[PDB]
């Protein structure tokens, strides 16, 4: 477990002409969005840019284009991950909104939270879930952001 | 530069007033003084730039 | 602060340069998979 | 025992497999991952995964990077960005790559440039380790 | 008379010029002169203030006067010879009371019976044992205050041994130089390792002691 | 003998200052390798550096007290 | 001889305080490295540092007892 | 010759405690830094620090018996 | 002289147990920090601590043979 | 005795420089293994190394003045 | 004088085995924490421990060669 | 007396060179573990190790000068 | 006095080999705890171990040349 008093980001496909994937995320990002401090949003895919754009023309941080129509890769995951880092937006508590596939009959737009802070991970009992550096932490925080990104992307 | 020269003079005086050293004592100290000079003047010029700029800024 | 982490460099970045090197490594056969992974056709929509 | 989950994006090599121990080239350096585990986080370097599977058999890999995740649990998770069995790498090539790496370094002259090149050197060299 | 009488005035005066010159620099001139000398207290207000406050401005300047006085007193013991063996030593004993009084000002003055109640209630001194508090009051002040005299006498010893071993090396090999130059070359470098280090650590004692003053102030 | 042994006995207690001078090298060493781990440099670690160099110089000031007692 | 060797023996026992002095630095240094790893400073680790300064000053009080017995 | 050398024999035999006090600081330091990595404190590891502080004082009772032999 | 130098000489050889005393605290100290890294306690690690306390008390047994050669 | 044991008393006072020499090795070693973690070379870790080698040879200048008192 | 100073001078050379015994606890202790990070037990690590203890007890066998040359 | 205790005064002054020898290993051994974390060899750590070898062998030079003082 | 003090004057200079004895154990021990972090064993680390062992037997080449000067 991690926490913050504080990268809300959703994951969508580039294109529509598929389900309510977009709708979901579009919805559920915004659904959140009121609650939190450092309100800033990131959209991967654009069938979210195309719906979550209305005023997310203003509250996106960056947005990412191509997703599907080119199958996702770790490689990619790293890319979007990378620049994402460089940005003073990190956690407002980050969350990742993606479509968790479950079955062809169901997916659930799922979300997780992205602790984009090493720092409280430094804090807490998380202190000794590691017992080894706010360095490498970050480089995992990193890595897992990519891993998840990849993952998310694929789901 | 002027300060440094004054400090050296003062020094020589205290030697002269007290019983003359064993020659060595003086040789080592004077050499020890010498070594700093060559670095020091390069530092001393640099010192000026820092503060008078920080003074000028405020 | 590794040459890269003190190049600032993301561990991702580092890592990716590694991966890139993996692709660099391997054999022809397995180079197929290089492109299978890798990359990004994505574009940073800067907004 | 340790349930070793050794996976890469591409595949799962070991999946919570009762491997006794795995020796990894964390960026910490080497590391001998044993049956249960510390809560520890580790970063992977270009070196080898030698997966001492609780059966004497040990598989080798060279892993470039990624994470090992060292749980309080006996569950160990190597998530290697890529960790490949050396099997699919080629020594001859390695040399060639390393050469290049070393060639490049010499003109690597932004810290980053140097660093990446150095990654190559380091890496390529590190392939040579076990190639 | 004159020899001791000229030395202590010299001591005072070298600290007095910096301590007078900086007050002066607060509007004129500066030309070469005032700005040049302002670097003296700018080096104090640069160097020593990197450690000071810390304890707080309140007392800061009270100590920094002693810190500068110590270093300036050593510097006045640093090119006069004969002077290190006498004037720095007479000044080390003249700095001896100031070092004692530096813990006095807030520690022993506010609590003599337990200046470790101001310095360190729980730590080295056992707070369960007021006896060890008073005993380690020596180990944290009475002896450290004697060790601060020794600490300047450590500079005096290391500076002096350079001289003596010089003295003895150029006396042993009065060749002009010649082979004594090899050892005397070392004995020169020894000036840095002994005096310039210990001289430092001597003012570091004044720094820390008076840190411990105003840090508990 | 009566005047000889006091001089030979003062130096022998001055060899007990070899334990305090290395115990200060271990306490300030493990604080120099205890500040690299970061980040509470002021307080906690370097505040207990003088608290670890007080009990280790306590063996030196007691030993140099037994060396001075055979001299005065 | 008899009033002489008591001064050239009580001083050699003060060289036994070299382990008490360098033992206090090592037990506290690794306590400064153990509290740099965090977080149980208040009891558990620094509480055991008192149980390490006692079992290290005991080999310094027993050595100071033999030095005091050959002097008084 | 007979009355004197026994006083300068138990004095140099007290310089064998300089290891029992510093070695106890080494073992109790490694248990102070060892428990930091956690979690076997009330078992396993601190039960091995008692087995270490004894073997270190085992050359501190063997050395102390020689200084008690030359005296009485 | 004949009964004097063998009584003060047997005391100087007892300063060879200061090495085995602190040398036993380190080999049992690194085994406390080693089993903290876990988990091959019985066999391998704690079976090597006997091989490390035997090669350290071998110089102790070599030093306790010297002090007993001038005592008997 | 008077003009003899003070020459063998300045030899025993120079054994106190085994702590100022082995304390510098412990200090200027942990500031080499600590800078390996990086990147606080100037202003922090090596600045504290000046205050680490200040309380290390402070027991050595106090041991070089004890031998200087048994000569001049 | 010619036989007396040969019995109390062979005892001062037995204090040179204090380095071979404390050094052996450092050459084996740094091998205990070495194989704790593992895994090269036989060969590489323990092979380097044998070439290290041989260079640690060499200052113990040469010091017992200057001890036995003063008594035999 | 004048020629006798000057020979036993230079020998105990040579025991003050036991801090520089063990200081040399603990300063060039922490840099042997510094480059193990890598990669500042011939940059920062190996450059400061020479500045660590000089601060420790100087306390061996200031002790060998006392041994040469009581020999010529 | 002349020949008598030359026997208990090279024996006190033989206890200076305790710094080189444990200094070689601290140097080679750090190399055993360094190649365990791997992998620059061949050259870089073990090649630097021959630079640290020579700079530790350098004090052993200056302390054994002292006791061999008071012999013949």
PDB file of N, CA and C in Angstrom, chain C residues 3-20:
ATOM      1  N   UNK C   3      26.642   6.091 -15.196  1.00  0.00           N
ATOM      2  CA  UNK C   3      26.978   7.010 -16.276  1.00  0.00           C
ATOM      3  C   UNK C   3      25.780   7.579 -16.902  1.00  0.00           C
ATOM      4  N   UNK C   4      24.766   6.752 -16.955  1.00  0.00           N
ATOM      5  CA  UNK C   4      23.513   7.149 -17.385  1.00  0.00           C
ATOM      6  C   UNK C   4      22.744   7.750 -16.267  1.00  0.00           C
ATOM      7  N   UNK C   5      22.666   7.193 -15.056  1.00  0.00           N
ATOM      8  CA  UNK C   5      21.852   7.860 -14.077  1.00  0.00           C
ATOM      9  C   UNK C   5      22.404   9.163 -13.635  1.00  0.00           C
ATOM     10  N   UNK C   6      23.635   9.435 -14.015  1.00  0.00           N
ATOM     11  CA  UNK C   6      24.325  10.641 -13.762  1.00  0.00           C
ATOM     12  C   UNK C   6      24.455  11.317 -15.020  1.00  0.00           C
ATOM     13  N   UNK C   7      24.027  10.636 -16.084  1.00  0.00           N
ATOM     14  CA  UNK C   7      23.667  11.346 -17.259  1.00  0.00           C
ATOM     15  C   UNK C   7      22.279  11.783 -17.008  1.00  0.00           C
ATOM     16  N   UNK C   8      21.774  11.528 -15.782  1.00  0.00           N
ATOM     17  CA  UNK C   8      20.471  11.781 -15.330  1.00  0.00           C
ATOM     18  C   UNK C   8      19.783  10.514 -15.626  1.00  0.00           C
ATOM     19  N   UNK C   9      19.740  10.193 -16.957  1.00  0.00           N
ATOM     20  CA  UNK C   9      19.132   9.125 -17.728  1.00  0.00           C
ATOM     21  C   UNK C   9      18.229   8.264 -16.981  1.00  0.00           C
ATOM     22  N   UNK C  10      17.044   8.059 -17.570  1.00  0.00           N
ATOM     23  CA  UNK C  10      16.090   7.158 -17.049  1.00  0.00           C
ATOM     24  C   UNK C  10      16.703   5.843 -17.011  1.00  0.00           C
ATOM     25  N   UNK C  11      16.325   5.105 -15.986  1.00  0.00           N
ATOM     26  CA  UNK C  11      16.624   3.749 -15.918  1.00  0.00           C
ATOM     27  C   UNK C  11      15.907   3.122 -17.031  1.00  0.00           C
ATOM     28  N   UNK C  12      14.704   3.592 -17.373  1.00  0.00           N
ATOM     29  CA  UNK C  12      14.065   3.166 -18.561  1.00  0.00           C
ATOM     30  C   UNK C  12      14.952   3.353 -19.719  1.00  0.00           C
ATOM     31  N   UNK C  13      15.500   4.555 -19.822  1.00  0.00           N
ATOM     32  CA  UNK C  13      16.286   4.894 -20.925  1.00  0.00           C
ATOM     33  C   UNK C  13      17.442   4.080 -21.039  1.00  0.00           C
ATOM     34  N   UNK C  14      18.098   3.899 -19.922  1.00  0.00           N
ATOM     35  CA  UNK C  14      19.204   3.056 -19.788  1.00  0.00           C
ATOM     36  C   UNK C  14      18.789   1.762 -20.294  1.00  0.00           C
ATOM     37  N   UNK C  15      17.701   1.280 -19.736  1.00  0.00           N
ATOM     38  CA  UNK C  15      17.217  -0.007 -19.916  1.00  0.00           C
ATOM     39  C   UNK C  15      16.953  -0.218 -21.327  1.00  0.00           C
ATOM     40  N   UNK C  16      16.333   0.728 -21.971  1.00  0.00           N
ATOM     41  CA  UNK C  16      15.950   0.664 -23.315  1.00  0.00           C
ATOM     42  C   UNK C  16      17.071   0.666 -24.216  1.00  0.00           C
ATOM     43  N   UNK C  17      18.174   1.241 -23.791  1.00  0.00           N
ATOM     44  CA  UNK C  17      19.320   1.235 -24.613  1.00  0.00           C
ATOM     45  C   UNK C  17      19.889  -0.115 -24.500  1.00  0.00           C
ATOM     46  N   UNK C  18      19.696  -0.757 -23.357  1.00  0.00           N
ATOM     47  CA  UNK C  18      20.024  -2.128 -23.196  1.00  0.00           C
ATOM     48  C   UNK C  18      19.256  -2.966 -24.098  1.00  0.00           C
ATOM     49  N   UNK C  19      17.934  -2.796 -24.117  1.00  0.00           N
ATOM     50  CA  UNK C  19      17.080  -3.600 -24.933  1.00  0.00           C
ATOM     51  C   UNK C  19      17.436  -3.460 -26.338  1.00  0.00           C
ATOM     52  N   UNK C  20      17.834  -2.250 -26.680  1.00  0.00           N
ATOM     53  CA  UNK C  20      18.163  -1.896 -27.989  1.00  0.00           C
ATOM     54  C   UNK C  20      19.367  -2.630 -28.321  1.00  0.00           C
TER      55      UNK C  20
END
